[PDB]
């Protein structure tokens, strides 16, 4: 990388998400309904005792394909091993888009896609749809109708193979339409 870190006078000051993350971890340690203790496999957990700030406290990465990371996942405090940005899974294969059909599961949504079929004898079309279940990271929050882009991953359940990587929101009460794309 030829260019290198321009200078503000506040960067070590804004470096206090370290204390934010530390206290979030200790509150999760004080939560006692939870059966097990959730933490990222990428982080020592001995980094939460030092004070020199020397080393990182949360892990993230970029997935490529021209998709930028969200600050909500960079600065969040949730433990999710199925997140594409802060988890332990990868994106490869197909990337498609659809509308959020339902959002009633834990960290999981249904994406409805629409398409056409040509019947040559009749020289005409019929409109068709399929359902596609997907995993939703806590860094996103969606409702019904919002457009979402989902990318392929390895199996994650009996029905899930895709993962949400972009949400283009749409206002409520809009006229439901075919919207094929």
């Amino acid at each position: 990388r030829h260019p290198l870190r321009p200078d503000p006078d506040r960067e070590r000051r804004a470096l206090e998400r370290a204390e934010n993350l530390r206290k979030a971890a200790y509150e999760m340690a004080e939560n006692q309904h939870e059966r097990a203790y959730h933490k990222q496999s990428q982080i020592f957990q001995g980094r939460f005792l030092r004070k020199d700030n020397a080393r990182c406290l949360r892990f993230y990465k970029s997935i490529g394909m021209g998709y930028h990371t969200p600050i909500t996942a960079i600065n969040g405090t949730y433990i999710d091993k199925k997140c594409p940005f802060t988890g332990n899974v990868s994106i490869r294969g197909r990337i498609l888009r659809g509308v959020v059909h339902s959002a009633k599961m834990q960290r999981s949504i249904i994406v409805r896609r629409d398409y056409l079929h040509f019947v040559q004898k009749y020289k005409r079309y019929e409109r068709r749809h399929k359902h596609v279940a997907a995993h939703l990271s806590p860094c996103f929050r969606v409702k019904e109708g919002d457009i979402v882009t989902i990318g392929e991953c390895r199996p994650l359940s009996k029905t899930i193979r895709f993962n949400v990587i972009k949400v283009e929101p749409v206002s409520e009460a809009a006229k439901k339409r075919f919207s094929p794309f």
Binding site: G64, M65, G66
Partner: protein
């Protein structure tokens, strides 16, 4: 099945092997080794079906037993041995030294060469990786490997090999403007110059070339072997990789009987 496949029906054989639909129910199935099963032509189908040195399997075998066939400077004794692109074909009893190239319909031709020519081999750099204890290797299109490779050698380039000592002497860089010949597709056997390398995230990269008479064509980057740098390093058949169209071909088929 419950295991690997040994047999091969004649109809299921590759189309470019030019077998004939009568004359058997079976075909020779190539053996594993230096080349694949689709982009190759076996040794027996070169000797017995092309040059008539043997009129049958039962006497092609013995030609290979007393070790009459040098491939890449080393003998071979397996009738189903897969010889492929750029392999050297020298039989000394009839004083014939060849290299394998493609014709302009996607078939395997044997070009004559000289003793000053059969001293090297062109290979396509398939990939660069790390093995035991952290060492680099280059693996190529002929299933050769070279360790401690010069760092300038990068993936998809071409190397020049000595058949005896097994070491690299020259290398050619795949850039915009290199004389190159295709190996698959429906432009197999045609030669042009790299003048576009268009890349796509996640998916295949496409390559656009042109012959020396203006005709242009496209393919994947998996099918562009590099032969020189604005001049080929090896010999090529007197058609030089220019394809005629169907009517020009038809008049030539008319001439050869006229």
């Amino acid at each position: 099945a419950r295991g690997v496949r040994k047999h091969l029906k004649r109809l299921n054989a590759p189309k470019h092997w030019l077998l004939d639909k009568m004359g058997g129910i079976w075909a020779p199935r190539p053996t594993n080794g230096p080349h694949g099963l689709r982009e190759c032509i076996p040794l027996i189908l070169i000797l017995r079906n092309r040059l008539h040195y043997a009129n049958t399997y039962a006497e092609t075998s013995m030609i290979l037993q007393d070790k009459n066939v040098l491939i890449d400077g080393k003998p071979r004794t397996d009738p189903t041995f897969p010889v492929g692109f750029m392999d050297v074909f020298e039989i000394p009893k009839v004083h014939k030294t060849f290299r394998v190239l493609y014709d302009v319909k996607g078939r395997f031709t044997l070009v004559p060469i000289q003793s000053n020519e059969a001293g090297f081999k062109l290979c396509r750099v398939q990939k660069i990786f790390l093995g035991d204890k952290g060492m680099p290797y280059l693996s190529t299109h002929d299933a050769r490997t070279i360790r401690f490779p010069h760092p300038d050698i990068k993936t998809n380039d071409t190397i020049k090999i000595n058949l005896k000592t097994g070491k690299i002497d020259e290398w050619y860089k795949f850039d915009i403007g290199k004389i190159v010949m295709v190996t698959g597709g429906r432009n197999c056997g045609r030669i042009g110059t790299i003048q576009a390398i268009d890349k796509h995230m996640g998916s295949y990269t496409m390559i656009r070339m042109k012959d020396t008479e203006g005709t242009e064509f496209l393919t994947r980057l998996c099918n562009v072997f590099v032969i020189g740098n604005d001049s080929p390093a090896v010999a090529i058949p007197t058609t030089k990789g220019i394809r005629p169209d169907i009517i020009k071909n038809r008049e030539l088929r008319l001439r050869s009987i006229a």
